[PDB]
Amino acid sequence: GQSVEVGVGTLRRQLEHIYRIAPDATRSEKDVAINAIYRQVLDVFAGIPPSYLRLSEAESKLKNNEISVREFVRRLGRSENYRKRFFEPYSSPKVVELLTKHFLGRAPISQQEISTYVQILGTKGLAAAVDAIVESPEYLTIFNEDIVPYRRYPTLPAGNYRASVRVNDEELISQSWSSLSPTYTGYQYVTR
Amino acid sequence: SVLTKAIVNADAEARYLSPGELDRIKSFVASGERRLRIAQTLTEARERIVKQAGDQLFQIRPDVVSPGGNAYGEKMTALCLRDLDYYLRLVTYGIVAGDVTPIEEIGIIGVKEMYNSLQTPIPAVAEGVRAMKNVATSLLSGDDAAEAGFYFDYLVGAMQ
Amino acid sequence: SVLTKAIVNADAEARYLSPGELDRIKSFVASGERRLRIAQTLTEARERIVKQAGDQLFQIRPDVVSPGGNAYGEKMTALCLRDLDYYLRLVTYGIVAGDVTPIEEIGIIGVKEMYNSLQTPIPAVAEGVRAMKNVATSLLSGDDAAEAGFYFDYLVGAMQ
Amino acid sequence: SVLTKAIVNADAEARYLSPGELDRIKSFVASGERRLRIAQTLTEARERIVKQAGDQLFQIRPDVVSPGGNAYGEKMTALCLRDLDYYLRLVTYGIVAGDVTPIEEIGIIGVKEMYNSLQTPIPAVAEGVRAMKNVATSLLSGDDAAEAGFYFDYLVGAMQ
């Protein structure tokens, strides 16, 4: 007999949290929530950047409630720190599905969409593509003005559950973003 | 368990367990031999708490074992007493785990949709679940009866 | 506290506190009387703990009290022990609550940036805290000394 | 390079290069032979430069080369000059590229984390680089010495 673990897990609903923020509500709570934005959006699997890219003035804008979580996420999407590390090295087709996931938690839906975003990256560039998503109906209903985005595994579109399982939490990020000094590969071993 | 719940928070914030989290694992595990012992009383009387629950349930709401009732008949009742046996089992699991993770995945998440489909009357079911508390609790010492009672009241809480 | 931490996680799944995230609170309440007592004991000997911590520190790291050292001089040393007095205070707070919570907001988040500006060697502040553990721990029963020790090792951990 | 930087901005906005971007490529390439001469001179005196930097460093910070110093000893000093040789090399790369892309990926992004692990005092590495500026700059004409100096001050800047 199959256990509770056998179908669609049980370890993934536990692992998905919804963080909101509560304007008048503690630094620590703010921090963890803020840290999760970084983890979902720029991959950061260890969940925090060695005081990197980050958000000087970005953090004060999000807290203060000057900016709302949706907005902060949109700023984060169009930035140098992001362009380099996810669009610096990829033809026009896998960068689109990667921009999709981080911000919609998935892969491209159908062949008709490999068109809407490829033409927006075609002509208006990366910044416009980021905005196209943060403002779509799908983004809005699911995480609206203030839910930090999370991984999804959604059931519905057909084929999308298995694609989603594969794009996120099954196949990680390869390829070093920078092109500066290739890794040589003839030396697996550390004998001494 | 407490662990499954006490680690998930750790991993989600990308960190080792807190002094607090470590302390509760400590206190929890110290209450092991005893928690095991409260869950053994309840397996002893597994079919007798259930039978007794069945009766109380039908006095407080009989209509379910009547012409137009979801549990009308001998095998529509066998199924009902069987669902009460299921939930008592899950309650013993919860008590030995020290939280609901197992109880939840097995028998509350999806339970509204299941019972709505069957048009079993769910809210009658909460009362039925409540009756088991009354019987089980009369076979346990004051201290152990309370510890058990939290898990019964959880199911009653979810269920509805 | 343990309360704050439990609750904050609760409101997060739109849920009620479950039978686990109640047991920890109960443990904490019993623990709190003992926890309150340990903090009071630590508070009584504060001047001795700080001073003896300060001697233990400057033997182990004489470079901080030397020409090019952050704590070189009588009033650069006075402020250094005052900072050691600050952290002992926060450690009593952490113990009593049962959760570290407030200490983090008061004295670790931002501490790298503060001390980097002042050019204070962080890892020798971590040593000053180990030194306080050693003194404080010698004024407490084995069981209470361990319970206190977790909070000292946390601060040592956070300055890292 | 100047090329890489211009292009990446072009492609990211889905467009051909600007008059400005084209102009800087033109001014840059006109300085090619000069930039190559600046790198040659410095490559030709590399062994002299690191050492004079190394003497200037140990006078200013005799402690780094002292009991509790990161560079204390003959082979802890040998590795230290080797790191100074590394950075001079990267500075020659930067000068011929006309920007820092290469310098950055090879030796500043991650440098805080690397040296913090090794417990190397970062600001005294910045001093070693100033020391190299002083030596290298004394082997170059006024105009070429300034052009070189920008790249030295960048590295000094990034270790900060």
Added chain:
Amino acid sequence: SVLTKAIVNADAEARYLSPGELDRIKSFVASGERRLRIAQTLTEARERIVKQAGDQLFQIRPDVVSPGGNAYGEKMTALCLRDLDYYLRLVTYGIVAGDVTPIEEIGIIGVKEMYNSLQTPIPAVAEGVRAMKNVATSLLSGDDAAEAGFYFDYLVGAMQ
């Protein structure tokens, strides 16, 4: 300008200007007097330039100035040269700024929508601009004529 562009990129990445960014400000400002001379010459001959562009245009496209043409008639032609005067002005602005920021906000972003409404044939406006390049360029030294020419070809590019 070159300044605005450099700074905006600096501020957006939360940082001081790069050696590269500093270099281009320096090369740019050195060309200040020259760029100002290029704008002066063209400002000084504006009425002649617009006209010779206008002759070159109506030979190449006598239709625009024909029954079903957007510029057909004396006052539909008067407005057409006025638009050519507008763009020459913006070209002088661009040359003294060293980039297109000003040229762009004033006269290309929205230009498709404006002219589509008026039903003006965009590509023949691009021709009017080439015609102005030809005239303006014949009043400038080889080196200054090229520097000017980049800004003419930009406008020609943006109407596309």
Added chain:
Amino acid sequence: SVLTKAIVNADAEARYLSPGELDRIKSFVASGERRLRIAQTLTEARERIVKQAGDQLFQIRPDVVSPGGNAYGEKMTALCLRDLDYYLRLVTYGIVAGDVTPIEEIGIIGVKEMYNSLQTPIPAVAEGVRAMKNVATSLLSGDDAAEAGFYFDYLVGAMQ
């Protein structure tokens, strides 16, 4: 092919072919259109399959591209991928015919003796073929990927 194999067995017995053998031929004819299509698909991506096979190979067995390795160097590696290109070609032949036949005569009978002479490690050639299976198989539908996979595993088998 399937034809050659069936016939050769027929003629050896000196009797016309009989119903079964015939059934296999009929299956092969229907299969052949699909088989021809798979070979064409494999042929289209040959350069990508070989190159990515070659990377997958040298990670898994870096020793062949090392001082005492058969494929050590740029042109000892060039010939190695050329051999991988040879075997992919033979795999397309095998698929199309429906029987392995010609591939055996072309590239396995005698292969031990050839490679032993050249001192090529045979089992790492078998690995290069597995690597090609992995790449080729990711460019084919499930059903076609299996049909192709049998021929890859044959070559892997014959080098044994």
Added chain:
Amino acid sequence: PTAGLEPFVRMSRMIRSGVPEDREEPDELW
């Protein structure tokens, strides 16, 4: 001939099969 296979000296975004020829080794000197 092996000309098609030859431009495979570019490897990947950054994948070179092992050891980058002569490599300076300055540790003795330092």
Added chain:
Amino acid sequence: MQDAITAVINNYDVQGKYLDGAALDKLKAYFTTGAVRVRAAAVISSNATTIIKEAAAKALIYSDLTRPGGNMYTTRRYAACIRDMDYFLRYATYAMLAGDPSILDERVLNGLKETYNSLGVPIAATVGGIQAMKEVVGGLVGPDAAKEASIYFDYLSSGLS
């Protein structure tokens, strides 16, 4: 991506070598052709639209491709095709400025062969569209730049076939 200059820097960085005579000679060979690359880019950019129109006219339209059943039938697909053409032209102009084809691999060729197989986009017909734009480009840019522009169009087209 990498250009001529960073190609050399990264090749030496992995060996930890300061730039030597051979390196310095390569970089000179780039710098010495640099002004010509810039002029060529300004011609291509400013004639972009005309190059596509003349390349389509010689190699794509007036054909079964633009008729019902053809892949560039429908205004939708005709638009997608000349959109693609603009990508090729624009990126080849980047490659030629950089003096390195690496950008054509990273941002254009990677996965494109299979993308076209999956949509049904005719590969051979697309190559002719590339080699027609090259033909036009080589006329417009002149003796100075013809060979240098040409190679990155040829890089593109053997990347698909």
Added chain:
Amino acid sequence: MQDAITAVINNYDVQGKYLDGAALDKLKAYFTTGAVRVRAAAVISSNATTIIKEAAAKALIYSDLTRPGGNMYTTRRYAACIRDMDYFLRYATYAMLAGDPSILDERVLNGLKETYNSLGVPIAATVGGIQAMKEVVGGLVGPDAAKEASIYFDYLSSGLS
């Protein structure tokens, strides 16, 4: 993921069994070691950085790995490597608290072998980095916890090889 308390429940749930004597004995065997797991985690967490530093010093740096041509050459890659090290240490601490290796499979090992093959990351060298951190950990945590911490480092390292 699952932990010892949770695994006992799901292992029985699939059989639809009440927890029985054998189950209850297993759970006791976990609870009875619980306080020791907590103390060990507090030592590891608070010495995290020193463990990585001492593990790298014994098993990674002062070597060809950190020299030009080596995979942990460049500040970028050195940073990525000790970043990884922190993951391993941190997750092993989770596995040891949970008393179950399932999290090491779900969130660390799955696909990692091939990820390292694809980037060129030396596997054998990474295992030594794991087994050096174990060595340090086993000293710091003491008799009580040494064997229990150790196994999840050994789980990690036979997961790569």
Added chain:
Amino acid sequence: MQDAITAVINNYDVQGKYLDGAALDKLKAYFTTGAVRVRAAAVISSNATTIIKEAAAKALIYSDLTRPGGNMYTTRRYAACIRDMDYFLRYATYAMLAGDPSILDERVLNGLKETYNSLGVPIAATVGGIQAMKEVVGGLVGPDAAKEASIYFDYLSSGLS
């Protein structure tokens, strides 16, 4: 998606043909069955829940499938399964109204076989759930519509196997 009518229009559009006699005959063959399709959809829609209930009762529950170890064990998975059932019923009703199966491919079958393999969802058992709903549907809709509804349930089920 496409229906009967747009199937014909697009088949002629690619040839650039005005609709001819053969086309017009096909469209008539659709229009002439149209009123019956509508009535059938109103029966299915308004009996939706009962069809699922009777189909599950004949082909899924009272079995190992609903017992521990079974894929429709847990209220979670039981809910997911009858949720799926509702999709099938609802889309088959769309296909039958449209008189074209193309929507069943575009929005239901594409990737579903492998999705079920990846989760462990039993394919053969799901087909029986489809062919049981067909059985119920064919009774409820009557002689007029029985054959026409039935085919799109059969389309669904040979799409999985």
Added chain:
Amino acid sequence: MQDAITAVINNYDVQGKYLDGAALDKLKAYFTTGAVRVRAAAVISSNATTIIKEAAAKALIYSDLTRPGGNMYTTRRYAACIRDMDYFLRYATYAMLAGDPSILDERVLNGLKETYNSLGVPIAATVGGIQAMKEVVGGLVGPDAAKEASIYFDYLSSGLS
């Protein structure tokens, strides 16, 4: 948010004071009520729906509020209103456990008065819905806990008026 205990810690932290004797009296009280607050919290939770089905009955429905023109007319708005009621009950239970009303300000009252003015939601009617739930709660929880639960319902209701 803050509770009894962190209210005291933060009040002393801003003065940089170690906890002194009177402060410690205050912590002793909270641990004395910790048993009853927990038992009481449980009771409310499982009887929640019953409880809520008595406060509406005595303070909201059978009225103009539920009739056309009323703010809890339509199943949509009736659902929104008893949804709100559940928030109040649930948060008041948090406040009472914490022994501090600060959470009722941070996560419930802030902006709510104007939100209700903007939608037209009747404030006075909502207060009666709060004070009816208090009435029910005070019966169910008993002498031990009645006064302590009650105050956070009263905090909520003077927060709106």
